[PDB]
């Protein structure tokens, strides 16, 4: 009756205990390391006769990896046999000289690509990891991206292993007992597997990102970066080829588009700019100015999204019909310092503070930044391009999401996955600003619900009342934003949707409606 230190790792579940990440128990077949080239092939022969399956080439190959996840110092793993298969042939395989069968509780992702950039994958700990370590983290198995890395310590458990017993008695079958577990390491995410699937359906041929947040605390119900990758491909430690084809896909599936990609926010920053206008200028939301197809400054002319122009327009209307010239005009009057302050406040400067390694911060172009990095001081027209969320203005979908959350509720939520991060709501806006958000919400409600709103024909057939804002980002065909909260009458959720080359905002409303309806259908509303 032999016992084994079986390497295991914690479970990752969705907000309803549905398994996002877990383990399956197998046997690894191992050979002694530093083995003679003549022995090796001979012992490989015996293994494939036991398990007529394994390709003589892939066993040799396996034995020769220099980044195996489960290798010992003096024995190397050549293959992964299911318990069903190993059971009958354990004893005779033990009996053969120089061959070992060791239980391994390896990673298994049941839903494959689902939430791949959220969950992330386990891998062999590298030399640059080890050389940089400041916490006596000497484990060969560690998380490499997303949650796996973020909570590696929690998920790895106390020592990284559990103790199992195998009884290949006089009997002809191997039983398997767990004598000591590795407990206190289940992690529970706020995701809803069911919603994440609807998100996966919505982006079936598309590229970009989608987030659905509880704006009262930060819980991310959905978080997709499309295209996703199939986490299982990384389980034994990624196949050198399988790695290539993930790196060479021109759609770039390794990138996290919701946390680690930048984009101009475009028209979506209009509420925030408008807030700055109200703070800093002798204006109310109801102040009405004329808004031709264009105005000019000196050398250049600044054009409205469409050439008809809009006639007269106040802030409600500007938001409603995404009027570029309103913002160009008052952009002339506002100070970039006072603008960029407003923008930073509502989130666009720094990180949202999400449970993922290396969240990206964007760029809020101000005047102290043009002088430092470049040389000339800030020109007036530069404000105007920033006022409509383009030029050197870059942001993540999370920043847009969090901004939307702030506009909806008055307080900045910290988007997170891990359910047990009490993430207290931050309050960056003052009483006057919170008061003035009221206008902005009505604005956003008009975009979705007033017949001239840009997303009116877009967002029809919605169970719950939506307040939304569409945008486009120019490319460094145009990226399309839609960002929203619901219900309008009493806001709880925020949704942010980015499609690369979706082009507009009145294709995306259909997606907002779809996800919004799937929420009501599953009783979140």
**DSSP secondary structure of 82-148:** EHHHHHHHHHHHHHSTT-EEEEEEEEE-TTTTTTHHHH--EEEPPHHHHHT-SS----SEEE-SHHH
Six-digit token pair at 502?
Answer: 């979706």
Six-digit token pair at 456?
Answer: 């009116």
Q: Measuring CA to CA, which residue among 104, 96, 44 is closest to residue 70?
A: 104
Looking at the chain, the domain(s) classified CATH 3.40.710.10 span: 200-244+259-521
Distances (CA, A) of 514 to 26, 136, 511, 521: 41, 48, 5, 10
Which are the contacts of 296, defined by CB distance < 8 A and separation ≥ 6? 302
CA atoms within 13 A on the CB side of 484: 34
In the block, tokens 């920053």 appear at: 269
The structure was resolved experimentally with: X-ray
Six-digit token pair at 153?
Answer: 């310590």
Q: Measuring CA to CA, which residue among 93, 34, 85 is closest to residue 63?
A: 34
Six-digit token pair at 471?
Answer: 């945008």
Spatial separation of the C-alpha atoms in residues 213 and 494, rounded to whole Å: 5
- Type and span of the H or E element at 223: strand 220-226
Chain breaks in the chain (C to N over 2.5 A) after: 476
Cβ contact 334:383 at 8 Å: yes
- Taking CA 215 as the corner, what is the angle to CA 209 and CA 218, rounded to the nearest 5 degrees? 75
Six-digit token pair at 61?
Answer: 């190959």
In the block, tokens 């920043």 appear at: 399
The count of other CB atoms within 10 Å of the CB of residue 29 is 24
Q: Measuring CA to CA, which residue among 457, 459, 477 is closest to residue 467?
A: 459
Cβ contact 101:29 at 8 Å: yes
Spatial separation of the C-alpha atoms in residues 510 and 516, rounded to whole Å: 10
**DSSP SS3 for 232:** helix
CATH 1.10.10.10 assigned to 200-244+259-521: no
Strands of the 161-168 sheet, one edge to the other: 2-7, 161-168, 174-180
Spatial separation of the C-alpha atoms in residues 187 and 125, rounded to whole Å: 21
**DSSP SS3 for 194:** helix
Q: Measuring CA to CA, which residue among 398, 358, 390 is closest to residue 210?
A: 398
Six-digit token pair at 96?
Answer: 């053969």
Spatial separation of the C-alpha atoms in residues 59 and 45, rounded to whole Å: 9
User: What resolution in Å is listed for this PDB structure?
Assistant: 3.0
Six-digit token pair at 427?
Answer: 């309050």
The count of other CB atoms within 10 Å of the CB of residue 221 is 25
CB burial class (10 A; 0-12, 13-18, 19+) of residue 299?
Answer: exposed
Looking at the chain, the domain(s) classified CATH 3.90.1310.10 span: 2-189
**DSSP SS3 for 456:** coil
Six-digit token pair at 80?
Answer: 């992964």
Six-digit token pair at 160?
Answer: 């990284």
Spatial separation of the C-alpha atoms in residues 131 and 68, rounded to whole Å: 19
The string over 97-125, giving b where at least 16 C-beta atoms fall within 10 Å of a residue's C-beta and e elsewhere, is eebbbbbbbbbebebebbbbbbbbbbbbb
Cβ contact 165:93 at 8 Å: no
Cβ contact 189:10 at 8 Å: no
CATH 1.10.1060.10 assigned to 2-189: no
**What 8-state DSSP symbol labels residue 276?**
H
CB burial class (10 A; 0-12, 13-18, 19+) of residue 439?
Answer: buried
Q: Measuring CA to CA, which residue among 481, 436, 473, 417 is closest to residue 455?
A: 481
Six-digit token pair at 341?
Answer: 């302050």
The count of other CB atoms within 10 Å of the CB of residue 407 is 25
* Dihedral pair phi/psi, residue 125, rounded to 5°: -70, 125
Distance of alpha carbon 476 from the chain centroid: 22
In the block, tokens 């479970």 appear at: 11
Q: Are strands 12-13 and 187-188 parallel, antiparallel or unpaired?
A: parallel
324-333 vs 380-387: helix axis angle to the nearest 10? 140
Six-digit token pair at 206?
Answer: 């598309």
Q: How far apart are the first and last CA of the chain?
A: 56
Spatial separation of the C-alpha atoms in residues 227 and 252, rounded to whole Å: 8
Spatial separation of the C-alpha atoms in residues 195 and 412, rounded to whole Å: 23
Cβ contact 394:362 at 8 Å: yes
Spatial separation of the C-alpha atoms in residues 140 and 395, rounded to whole Å: 36
Cβ contact 268:483 at 8 Å: yes
Which are the contacts of 462, defined by CB distance < 8 A and separation ≥ 6? 512, 513, 516, 517
- Type and span of the H or E element at 187: strand 187-188
Six-digit token pair at 240?
Answer: 């050198």
The count of other CB atoms within 10 Å of the CB of residue 134 is 5
Q: Measuring CA to CA, which residue among 187, 140, 159 is closest to residue 21?
A: 187
CB burial class (10 A; 0-12, 13-18, 19+) of residue 215?
Answer: buried
Cβ contact 486:396 at 8 Å: no
In the block, tokens 């597997």 appear at: 193
Which are the contacts of 173, defined by CB distance < 8 A and separation ≥ 6? 87, 88
Which are the contacts of 283, defined by CB distance < 8 A and separation ≥ 6? 277, 315, 330
CA atoms within 13 A on the CB side of 266: 22
CB burial class (10 A; 0-12, 13-18, 19+) of residue 456?
Answer: middle
Spatial separation of the C-alpha atoms in residues 204 and 186, rounded to whole Å: 31
Residues in the chain: 525
Q: Measuring CA to CA, which residue among 481, 438, 456, 430 is closest to residue 269?
A: 481
Which are the contacts of 99, defined by CB distance < 8 A and separation ≥ 6? 29, 30, 31, 43, 46, 47, 93
Q: Kindly state the greatest CA–CA separation across the chain.
A: 94
Spatial separation of the C-alpha atoms in residues 193 and 190, rounded to whole Å: 9
Spatial separation of the C-alpha atoms in residues 387 and 324, rounded to whole Å: 9
Q: Hey, which residues does 80 pair with through a beta bridge?
A: 28
Which are the contacts of 104, defined by CB distance < 8 A and separation ≥ 6? 6, 7, 25, 26, 27, 28, 70, 77, 80
**DSSP SS3 for 492:** coil
Q: Hey, which residues does 484 pair with through a beta bridge?
A: 468, 495
336-345 vs 270-280: helix axis angle to the nearest 10? 130
* Dihedral pair phi/psi, residue 63, rounded to 5°: -45, -25
Spatial separation of the C-alpha atoms in residues 142 and 69, rounded to whole Å: 9
Cβ contact 490:483 at 8 Å: no
Cβ contact 346:140 at 8 Å: no
In the block, tokens 């008055």 appear at: 410
CB burial class (10 A; 0-12, 13-18, 19+) of residue 17?
Answer: exposed
Cβ contact 276:338 at 8 Å: yes
Distance of alpha carbon 493 from the chain centroid: 18
Q: Would the CA dihedral through 407, 411, 415, 416 be positive or negative?
A: negative
Six-digit token pair at 477?
Answer: 């065909």
């Amino acid at each position: 009756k032999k016992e084994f230190l079986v390497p295991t790792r914690g479970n990752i579940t969705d907000r309803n205990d549905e398994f996002l990440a877990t383990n399956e128990l197998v046997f690894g077949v191992f050979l002694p390391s530093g083995l003679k080239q003549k022995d090796l092939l001979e012992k490989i022969e015996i293994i494939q006769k036991f398990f007529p399956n394994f390709s003589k080439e892939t066993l040799l190959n396996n034995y020769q990896k220099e980044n195996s996840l489960y290798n010992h110092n003096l024995i190397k793993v050549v293959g992964f046999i299911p318990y069903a298969t190993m059971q009958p042939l354990y004893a005779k395989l033990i009996q053969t000289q120089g061959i070992f069968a060791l239980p391994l509780d390896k990673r298994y992702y049941p839903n494959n690509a689902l939430a791949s950039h959220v969950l992330g994958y386990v891998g062999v700990a590298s030399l640059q990891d080890l050389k940089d370590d400041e916490e006596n983290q000497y484990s060969q198995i560690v998380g490499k991206t997303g949650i796996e890395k973020e909570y590696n310590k929690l998920l790895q458990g106390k020592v990284g292993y559990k103790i199992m017993r195998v009884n290949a008695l006089n009997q002809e079958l191997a039983t398997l007992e767990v004598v000591l577990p590795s407990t206190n390491n289940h992690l529970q995410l706020s995701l809803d597997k069911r919603l994440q699937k609807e998100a996966d359906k919505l982006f079936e041929n598309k590229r970009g990102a989608i987030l659905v947040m509880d704006a009262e605390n930060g819980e991310l119900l959905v978080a997709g970066s499309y295209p996703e990758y199939n986490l299982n491909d990384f389980v034994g430690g990624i196949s050198q080829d399988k790695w290539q084809k993930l790196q060479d896909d021109i759609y770039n599936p390794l990138l996290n588009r919701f946390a680690n990609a930048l984009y101009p926010p475009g028209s979506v920053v209009k509420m925030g700019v408008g807030l700055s206008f109200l703070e800093n200028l002798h204006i109310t939301e109801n102040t009405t100015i004329p808004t031709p197809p264009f105005i000019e400054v000196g050398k250049h002319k600044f054009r409205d999204w469409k050439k008809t122009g809009h006639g007269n327009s106040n802030l409600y209307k500007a938001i409603r019909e995404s009027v570029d010239v309103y913002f160009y005009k008052f952009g002339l009057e506002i100070s970039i310092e006072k603008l960029s302050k407003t923008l930073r406040e509502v989130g666009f400067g720094e990180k949202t503070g999400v449970d993922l390694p290396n969240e990206f911060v964007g760029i809020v172009p101000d005047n102290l930044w043009k002088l430092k990095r470049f040389n000339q001081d800030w020109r007036v027209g530069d404000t105007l391009i920033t006022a409509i969320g383009q030029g050197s203005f870059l942001a993540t979908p999370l920043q847009v999401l969090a901004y939307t959350g702030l506009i909806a509720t008055g307080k900045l939520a910290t988007p997170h996955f891990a359910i047990n991060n009490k993430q207290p709501l931050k309050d960056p806006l003052n009483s006057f600003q919170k008061k003035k958000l009221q206008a902005l919400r009505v604005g956003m409600y008009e975009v979705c619900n007033h017949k001239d709103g840009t997303a009116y024909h877009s967002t029809r057939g919605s169970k719950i009342t939506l307040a939304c804002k569409t945008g486009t980002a120019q490319v460094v065909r145009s990226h399309a934003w839609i960002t929203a909260f619901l219900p309008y009458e009493k806001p709880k959720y925020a949704i942010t949707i980015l499609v690369e080359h979706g082009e507009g905002g009145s294709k995306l409303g259909g997606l907002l409606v779809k996800m919004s309806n799937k929420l009501y259908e599953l009783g979140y509303l």
